[PDB]
Paper text:
Type I RM enzymes house these activities in a multisubunit complex having ATP-dependent translocation activity that pulls thousands of duplex DNA base pairs through the stationary enzyme, eventually cleaving at random sites distant from the recognition site. Upon identification of an unmethylated specific DNA sequence, two HsdR motor subunits, which bear the endonuclease and ATP-dependent DNA translocation activities in the fully assembled DNA-HsdS-HsdM2-HsdR2 complex, start to translocate the duplex DNA toward the stationary enzyme from both directions, producing two extruded DNA loops flanking the enzyme complex. The X-ray crystal structure of the HsdR subunit with bound ATP from the Type I restriction enzyme of [name] plasmid R124 revealed four structural and functional domains forming a planar array: one nuclease domain of PD-(E/D)xK type that houses three endonuclease active-site residues and a QxxxY motif common to the RecB-like nucleases; two RecA-like helicase domains of SF2 type that use ATP to translocate duplex DNA without unwinding; and a C-terminal α-helix-rich domain presumed to contact the HsdS-HsdM2 methylase. ATP bound between the two helicase domains was found unexpectedly to also contact Lys220 of the endonuclease domain, suggesting a means by which nuclease and translocation activities might communicate.
Numbering used by the authors: 12 to 139, 149 to 583, 591 to 859, 873 to 885
Amino acid sequence: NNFIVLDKYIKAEPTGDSYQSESDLERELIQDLRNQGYEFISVKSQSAMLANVREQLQNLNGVVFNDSEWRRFTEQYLDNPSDGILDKTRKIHIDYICDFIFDDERLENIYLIDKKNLMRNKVQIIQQRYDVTILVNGLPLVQIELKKRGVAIREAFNQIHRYSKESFNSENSLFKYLQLFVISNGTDTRYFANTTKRDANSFDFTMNWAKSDNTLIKDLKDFTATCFQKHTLLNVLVNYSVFDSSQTLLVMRPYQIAATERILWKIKSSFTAKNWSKPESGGYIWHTTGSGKTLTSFKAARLATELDFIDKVFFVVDRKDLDYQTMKEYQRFSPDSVNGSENTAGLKRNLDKDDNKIIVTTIQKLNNLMKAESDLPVYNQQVVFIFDECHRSQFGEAQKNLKKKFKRYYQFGFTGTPIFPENALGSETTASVFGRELHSYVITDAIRDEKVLKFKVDYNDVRPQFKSLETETDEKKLSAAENQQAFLHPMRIQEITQYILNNFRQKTHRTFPGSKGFNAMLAVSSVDAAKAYYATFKRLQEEAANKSATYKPLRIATIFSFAIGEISDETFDTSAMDSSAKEFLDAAIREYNSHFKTNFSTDSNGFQNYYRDLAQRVKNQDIDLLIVVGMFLTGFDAPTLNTLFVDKNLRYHGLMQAFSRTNRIYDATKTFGNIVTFRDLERSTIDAITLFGDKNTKNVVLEKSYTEYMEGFTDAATGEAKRGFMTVVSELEQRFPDPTSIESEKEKKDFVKLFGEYLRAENILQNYDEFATLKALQQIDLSDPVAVEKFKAEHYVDDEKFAELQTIRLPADRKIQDYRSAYNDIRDWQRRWDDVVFEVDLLKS
Ligand SMILES: Nc1ncnc2c1ncn2[C@@H]1O[C@H](COP(=O)(O)OP(=O)(O)OP(=O)(O)O)[C@@H](O)[C@H]1O
Ligand SMILES: [Mg+2]
């Protein structure tokens, strides 16, 4: 099998020589790479480098340039001056073959890399800031930054990589070819992709290499022995990196790679055994929701097409999970054939295509196809299925005619929430359908690796009158409760909507003006609910428009089309909807059109276009709040969406998938996803988490209490003590009255450590309603208690709670700015102590 993500790996042993300075780490890095087959050469210039490339490409392609021809190949294809990192990257991954016309007029195909036979490519290393650069056919595709042992790797990542887009001179030109960065202090080694567009991911996207059980490989020697094994490295560079329709480069994380290669080997081995068309031919990957199932599964599909014996590879997704970006991606492969309709024509067309393998479609369309068409030639062909998270509504019938009509097949599935006998619900189980579990990356592991955010979950109890309904467990009483007499009661909706309007900005980190921040979804129970909330938001927002011309409204959109508490599949056919809803939808689409200057109508085509454009605008924050029923709750990917407002009954897999809309990692600003619920989901939340996990999993997944973060607590998984906000406040007032107290070195560093804690803690506490109330109390009184009474009604606080809140002592507003200016004055001096990490992202706001 030759897997590059190891099942077992025996930890290496230190040479006893000094491992402290960058010189040490570099010495042994070069030594190790050299032992693993990387030739150390000396390149002191862009010219020496170019000459080396000439040798390697000539060697590789079996050809010889003259100086003229070579100058031309350099100026046009290889080192073209107009090209940036993006262009170089497209040349590495998409078009690596230059069709070159020699001076004698013949055509040769000049390869940058041999992707069929990987080990033919020449790998070698040069050195420098301490850096070791890994050259593939002379081209610098990898770079290793080395810092000393006591250096905080995050600050070192802050340093370059966000400090900013450092120019590219004429002599460093070839280094625009860099695909992959690896940074290490020897204790910890993290790798990550080179950013093309001028965006530049945060530290949260960096990752340690790992084994198939997802246990980390942290230290440079072991990282080297594994990731930098030439076979491993080249595979990461060539096969397990992705360059997509957004022109963004992504390196796959270890778990994604392991799952993928295990799928591929499963296909190969089952084929040579003639073991096709059985559950033992395929498998399922259990990758926790939001860990990249879609990236990975489609990458596996594209890779499974590279098997000589496979005629067709189906990549099928649930039309429910389609969004603007993912549709854009699939357009390049199966044009106009991936959407929310039932039509099979596009599928039939892609199916008959000379020189093609990949067939991207929806489980709906696949189902309809296999229903209606029994004579297809693809049926007797050698076929692979990759099912990305379409396990339910149309899946049963789909599987039925699958096993019926497909004679030679290997079928696989990805899910974050598997089907177990417990939650079976009429559907065959995941294990039953796909057979063995080939790999897993489970939520606790994902949280541990910080590749998925945790949740903060609270039932908002402001509503004594409606609380009986909001806590109701019986299934039949909830169905009956949809009406203006109970759940859709005007006062309930008014009060809730008022809450969302009041606390939107606080939740989304939009509070501080001159800060970008996040946005939200509201997920509701029914079409009428959506209709009511959209109605009520518009009214309440036009009311406060009169109260003030300093009132800045939120942009609100909605989308719904004709539907336990599981999530119902909505059709994309808006002809099914009753006249009331279609009237309301049309109106909102008209408002939407006039606002965004779009032309969308409500016929299925116009609605589909509405769906696409909506997704893009919610993703980029042109929409502040998306009110929804069953849409964009399962596969929608929006790293800037941090808060989900919930008036709905969500259970089990539906629960997780809905909440997981906020689970995407972004930077130190977005600490966890915010879930705010106007029905009580506590027991359902815990049920759901425990379903995929154990009794303890909920302690990892759910964020801690307000009191804990104020007074401190002890993290169970780490074992570490996380000091509370008031102990930080206390220690700031005590140890650093300031600015006089700044002075000596140690008293500076200690202040940076402490104020780091401060900024993190306060940022975390923004999301707590208690803390919002506490901070809002800091303006208020002296004279007219019109605001004092206004403060009580808005934050739902009585005279009892109000009494002690006076006593809680926070630092003066001026003192926070003294602290902040001091923090900057230190960090800047530092740019002109290895232990420390400044919070730049938290600072910037
Ligand atoms: N290796 C990677 N490097 C950088 N970013 C990644 C990587 N893998 C995934 N992501 C990002 O994480 C986000 C979520 O990925 P994706 O939607 O593919 O996950 P998912 O498991 O399908 O989520 P869901 O369970 O909600 O459908 C995407 O924006 C994706 O770009
Ligand atoms: Mg997905």
